UniProtKB/Swiss-Prot annotation, chains A, B, C, D:
Intervals, Cytoplasmic compartment: 183-255, 297-311, 417-512
Organism: Oryctolagus cuniculus (Rabbit)
Tissue note: Detected in skeletal muscle (at protein level). Fast- or slow-twitch skeletal muscle.
Lineage: Eukaryota, Metazoa, Chordata, Craniata, Vertebrata
Subunit-level organization: Homotetramer. Can also form heterotetramers with RYR2. Identified in a complex composed of RYR1, PDE4D, PKA, FKBP1A and protein phosphatase 1 (PP1). Repeated very high-level exercise decreases interaction with PDE4D and protein phosphatase 1 (PP1). Interacts with CALM; CALM with bound calcium inhibits the RYR1 channel activity. Interacts with S100A1. Interacts with FKBP1A; this stabilizes the closed conformation of the channel. Interacts with CACNA1S; interaction with CACNA1S is important for activation of the RYR1 channel. Interacts with CACNB1.
Designated name of the protein: Ryanodine receptor 1
Residue(s) carrying Phosphoserine: S342
Localisation per UniProt entry: Sarcoplasmic reticulum membrane
Transmembrane segments: 118-138, 162-182, 256-278, 280-296, 312-332, 396-416
Amino acid sequence: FRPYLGRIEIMGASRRIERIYFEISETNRAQWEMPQVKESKRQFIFDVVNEGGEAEKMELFVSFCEDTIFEMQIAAQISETAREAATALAALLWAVVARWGELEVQRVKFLNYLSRNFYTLRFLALFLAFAINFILLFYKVSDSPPNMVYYFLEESTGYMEPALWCLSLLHTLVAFLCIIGYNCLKVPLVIFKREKELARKLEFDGLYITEQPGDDDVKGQWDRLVLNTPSFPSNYWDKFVTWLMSIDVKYQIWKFGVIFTDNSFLYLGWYMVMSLLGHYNNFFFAAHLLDIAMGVKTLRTILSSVTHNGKQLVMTVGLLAVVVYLYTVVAFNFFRKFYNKSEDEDEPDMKCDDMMTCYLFHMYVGVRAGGGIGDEIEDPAGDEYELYRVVFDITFFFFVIVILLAIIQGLIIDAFGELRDQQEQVKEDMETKCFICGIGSDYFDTTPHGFETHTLEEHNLANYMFFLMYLINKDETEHTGQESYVWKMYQERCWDFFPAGDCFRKQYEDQL
Amino acid sequence: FRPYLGRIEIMGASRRIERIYFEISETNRAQWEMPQVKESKRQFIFDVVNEGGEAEKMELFVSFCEDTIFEMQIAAQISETAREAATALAALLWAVVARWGELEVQRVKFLNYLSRNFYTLRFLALFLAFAINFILLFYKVSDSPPNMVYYFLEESTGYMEPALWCLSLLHTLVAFLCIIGYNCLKVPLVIFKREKELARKLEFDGLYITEQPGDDDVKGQWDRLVLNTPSFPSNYWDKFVTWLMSIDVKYQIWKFGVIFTDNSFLYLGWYMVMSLLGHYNNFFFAAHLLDIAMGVKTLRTILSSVTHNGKQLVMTVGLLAVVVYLYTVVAFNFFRKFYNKSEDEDEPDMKCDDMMTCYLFHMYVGVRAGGGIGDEIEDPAGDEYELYRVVFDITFFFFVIVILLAIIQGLIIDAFGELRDQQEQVKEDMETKCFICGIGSDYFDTTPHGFETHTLEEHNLANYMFFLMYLINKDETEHTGQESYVWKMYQERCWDFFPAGDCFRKQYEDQL
Amino acid sequence: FRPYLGRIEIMGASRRIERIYFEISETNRAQWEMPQVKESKRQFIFDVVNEGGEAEKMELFVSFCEDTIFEMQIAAQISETAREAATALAALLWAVVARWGELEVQRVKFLNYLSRNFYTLRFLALFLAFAINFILLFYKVSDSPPNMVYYFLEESTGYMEPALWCLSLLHTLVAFLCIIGYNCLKVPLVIFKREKELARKLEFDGLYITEQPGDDDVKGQWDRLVLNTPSFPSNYWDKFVTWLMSIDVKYQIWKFGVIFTDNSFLYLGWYMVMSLLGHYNNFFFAAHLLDIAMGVKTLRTILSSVTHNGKQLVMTVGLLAVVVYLYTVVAFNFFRKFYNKSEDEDEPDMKCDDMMTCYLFHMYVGVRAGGGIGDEIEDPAGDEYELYRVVFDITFFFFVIVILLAIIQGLIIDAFGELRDQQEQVKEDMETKCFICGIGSDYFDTTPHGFETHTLEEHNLANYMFFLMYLINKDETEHTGQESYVWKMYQERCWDFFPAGDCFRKQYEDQL
Amino acid sequence: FRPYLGRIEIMGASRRIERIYFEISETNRAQWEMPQVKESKRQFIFDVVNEGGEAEKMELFVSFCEDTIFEMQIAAQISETAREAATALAALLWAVVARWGELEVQRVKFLNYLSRNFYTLRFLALFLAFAINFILLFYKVSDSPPNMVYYFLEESTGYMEPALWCLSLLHTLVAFLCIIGYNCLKVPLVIFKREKELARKLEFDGLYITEQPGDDDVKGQWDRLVLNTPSFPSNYWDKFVTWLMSIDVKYQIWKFGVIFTDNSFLYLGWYMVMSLLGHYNNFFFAAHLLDIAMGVKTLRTILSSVTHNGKQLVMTVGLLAVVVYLYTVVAFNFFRKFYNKSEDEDEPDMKCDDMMTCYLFHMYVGVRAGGGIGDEIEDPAGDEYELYRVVFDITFFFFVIVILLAIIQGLIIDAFGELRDQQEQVKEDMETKCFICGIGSDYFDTTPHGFETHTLEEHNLANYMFFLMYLINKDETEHTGQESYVWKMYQERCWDFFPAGDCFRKQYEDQL
């Protein structure tokens, strides 16, 4: 019974580590192989290692375990020429990106079918958006019929317009299907997470009964309504913390408040509204190309690097604006005659006659010039302010290009590199120090495959998760002494039963 | 009595750590919550961790404690279209930047009121300067009446000029109020710091009595006058180290010498003189925009990065100047005919006929070109020196752009990154190793919330500060044995009473 | 007998380290000095240290030892004006780069002669290619005889064309000789490596007998034919795992499948086909200049840096393409009139009338401009969309130049630096921690020249290799107890006989 | 007798550390304060810490001690508008840069006077060169009298030409004086160093008597003549390893061979020859401006960064040349018509008609363009090879600008940063781990000012140096037991008498 037996180590009343054996049913291990729960697990370890909250690590692990229980129970419910180059480039890009009662029963079966393949639905939506964007590359504009008129250039196939129309139709349909699948699959997970957070806060902190909700807490203030609900716990296990009559209005608006406040739900709603707007104008479908950035981990890291140092970037942009304003002040006061940008002398284009123009001209040209503001303005040849302009142009070029723009670029690059290094450090910590007790890697490295054996069966996270399922399923009376102790102390919400400092090998190294 | 009881650990005559309990009055803990003293505290730990002076760490801590006593006693005395885009950008910028006897009594009350809100006064001055600068963006120039004449463009509101005049008036008034508040609030702090430094030097080093003041010490030489003063100690506690008759002239000029030598006082005087000059010309108010750079920590770090490697930057600039001079020598000797910058052949603009022109032209164009001096000068097509110019232009472009400018930019970026890393390391050390004894983080990390308990009550800096207040207030006779010992050895100015290597937990780990 | 005596340390049945002495013949040590085996050794340590496979380190060492045995047995079988500047540059470059039965007997002697000097043959081929490329620099084109006609400019020597023809002839001949030498020298090595891998897999894993070959394994599926061969082991020692009749067809096609799947053989075949194509057009010889990149370690690292982050680079390129497509969409929808690139107004060159042109124009100009797409397009002077274009051009310039291109350049630079740092770390580990037991450097550093003595004789890799040769040559009956034990346990393919944790010095430090 | 007493720690026959006291004469400590010996000391520690030769550290220290003895004995023998901006810039630059028998007796006194102030003489030479270069900035050229004629522009002072002539005269005179001072001051030091190296090699290695001098050793082969000299040891202490008659010819040419092979002597000879050439043409004095680069440590590091990665830089330049040659091949074969650089169509300037022109044009324009070769060549508008040129220009721009030039710039920047980090690490090691025994910093940091006391008197390098002087001066008979033992074992040239692992504090920590 190698795959039906699980080994876990807990510290008991004896103040020493003790390994116990519990039966693992095939159903519990079967649900662990779903890609969704595996991705959630990887996200959990990534987040906890990045945060570094060792003190609250056990609480986060327990929350992750409860989230896994909810995910697998949900899965149980849902269980049954130039165009040639353009085509080549699109194919190359796609490739990597690639890499009564009976009516109610039918409706819930269709909803479960939609929930079963939701990532596949998102992939199909991405493919439809990519195809639509590729089709849009053939658009042409001309005054003559096929004001400005946008038409399609005559292609060899000739089926371009009906193909685009059909692709837009299935794109809208698949966006609706994806939002329905998300509402029926991942929305209950966040609903249960918020209900558990509220229940724990009310039970162990008195957030409402023993204290005020507080200030600057939208979630806390909004959560005020759930308490009076006849069903405050609906997606959380602890339930003791005719369709119109059964539905409770306050619970419905509360739950809706949870959904529309979710980031993923908001993103999917934005996708749906962009798909709807794409019918008014086909060029609106280009907004769906951003799903490549979110889907790819590297592109997501690139996007997050911009907001990683948002405060510092904003401060640097403000400093650059102040510096450019000072230089514009100096130019307006002393160097107005050098800002003529018209070749013809009949109508000179004075760019520094007004301060806003001198400011807009500076901010648009000097920053992007790469050699300073002196390149655009007239060269100081024979002027009485020759040394003064030369100094002005050298100082502007230096202080802007070599410092201000360089600082911003270095900040963005450093944020991206820091995020990549954080991911690499998370991976190295996971493959070096085990998650359960975090003992040194060399101690197990002395024994051949010591760390592999320590993580596979001795301190496997899946083993503890399956132990939690087994404790939940098994009755209190049938629990053994160690099982009863661990269950009673788990209901106490105090996690010192983990191996913590040491394991079985360290305790009895001489015996082993 | 949880908040009225303080626990501190000191090493006594028994050569072992010993925790003692002292009563904490509510008044002492109340004054600790002022933002000014908290900011001074953060600055103190930042400076001491950056310096790394572990040997003199206790002396710096004692000096900080005395400065806190003086700060809280002072607080006790003072205790009672295009314009739409421009508006949007200004609002966004501002946002972050933001985020007889009776007469004498009235005068001192007004002065205390000014001192109470000094940071708020500085914020109001910054807002006034920002508003004035925003107003100045609408300035326009034209020969015709509203020589060159500067007038205001016709705006929709039409209240622009009176608003600017009033804003300048309140800007000058608030600058005067801010300088008065600084003179009445922070000037006594630096006065007391200098008086304590002088007293300690005279008592424990014989800087004047037992030795010469020295050379290249402006502060030491100037401090010569305070000694003869009938009031050498005026803002320092150790006093034993009719208005015209009461005031001592020598003390007055000495104190004034302290004030005008202060960096912050000099900066505020520069602000005041710029505000005064702004009435002569409204464009002079742009100098006040630099307060954004000083106020923001990131912008202050950016400014300090320039001067962090000032010597290396100056040496690199000198090397670049020497290289450009050598290239100018070569061009003047061999490549004079290639420096014609006039399209019309009637009046050629020979830029290398004179060595200073060839030098000024090189230093202005070749550095900022980004592709070398060869871009500006005529291309060597068919010339007898084709290979020689090509080599000259390649060598110039390489040695300047790829090396000299790159070295300067990398030096600035490295200075900025080093300052940011120093701040991050200071923060990590503060949140990892406690300031009092500096024991390892893992030792307390073995016990859950061990470091938090160790820093909150076991080795709290505020606890030692409150103990110092309690010792100062309590009489010598009422002092206990440990209190008398610590007071007598504090008057000895020798700080080995700190826990130093170990604490209570390490000493009696088995018992605990 | 200093050079004829070898000392090695092994752990035996006594569970303690034990050094034994074995006779080293001069023949075994003589073959160790060949540059080929030394380069293979350096590559082996570099690869194993870079991989970091400590658990499989001993298996890799045993494989390297077997490869060395095969290499030395193979060696036993084969044992017996502007042109002046161009010339100066070519010489400087080359320098650094520089740095019946009797018939069968004659044929095998010629083949052995070719195999003896193969690196020299490659160097001669590189010299011939460099000379041909230098000759090609004098090519000129003109319509007139010596359609477009390519001829040779009249040189002072006048022997240019016959020299080029002869150089091409010997280049083709030396390419053929090099491919023959590689087939007769290094092809048997890879053949033996694949045969040993197959034998080990079949013996210890049941890859075919006890299991399926698997999926996505071209080598495993192709290796299916060798099994039925009457000679499955031909270049592997374990042989028990009329020319037409002797040759086995299945073995011949299997072996050929091994050769044409080799990277080095494929590269040499590409070299040969390029040499053959160079006769059709002499400009095809420029492909042979890539051998400089492969030959030089620094240039090879530079090339490998591009593919080190290939996935991230592809993702970044895709993100850049998506961003440029979005900007092209915006320009086509709103800023079509600003894309006129024709000076003459009679025939405007509308670059954004068609979406593909606007996309191709963007991807070709905006990326390489360095200041954004605004430089190429007309300046927005007086247009109703002045603020909108300014924002468009600033956002494009920022998001492309400062982020997208900077990220790609930083990724390439970081990959190159990471490869260089990996090589430096491999070297530091080799010169700091010995390969055999990996004890600390300081422990031997306490004793003067402790590490040198520990690596020269105590734990020399060459010593273990020579011990392996001595065990192979010596009969089983004549083996000593330790030798018999090590041989029997080596046939068990379990490598715990290495010193592993400790050596002789650590075991008996007090005695020593 | 605090400054006349020295404490050193040595390990004796008892195998334990033992501190002994020796009398320090005032003369020995007086000579230690010369700036020359201090700079030599700093250079010695910098070099030894950078090298990391712990095994040979004691030998290097002994060599440094002997060099100090020779330096102090030598000192004993020698002991007795636009021009306004240009002036401001020159002053600012200079500032930082700033920061019978009786006849023989007179000649040797003059030589000693020259040797006494040699750094001052070099500073005066640098000032003269800077003044001459500043004067040269006023040169002007014109056809008319004051072929091309170089004259001086009319200045306000009018004394420019005689001042320049006099400055050149004293520059030549001071260069001669500096070379004489170097010959009489530092040349004997290198002579003694080479004589000691030869003596040690002959005594302890048999470089000539017991073996051949070797190959690729210019110093070893040249040193062959000194052996037969009647005075092989002339500047080395171990002398037992009529002017025309006294001088030995072979020794004279040998010594001259030592001098002209020295780097500093060669640099000073180059300075002298440049000064001599400056009289023929005053513009030749610009070569002396390089002394700023050598004098300043930062500028010297900048110069050394170029040659730090010389091999890698050469390989990268060769790879860039090969890539540019391949691109030129492609352009010549397919894109010849796009290389017209003449605005007038009457005489097109075909830049790719000849391969060398296409190669020279590519290497001069594409590298320095910053946007690729596509900017200079005609835009592909409507051509049949539109996609092919676009791909060609994108690939060229990427592979050159983003990779090849970026790699070179990053290599130079990394070399400079590595040199700066090496200097910083040397400083940190010196201020953290003492040079003598290298014990941990924390061990002495436990005791207040423990490291300061450990380095000032316990393990002072100057203390060991003064002990060496005292042993040299004191007779063998008067030596004490420890002194006799250390002297006899120093003549054995084996340095295990250093404290090495531990010191007095570690040996008797309980007693202390």
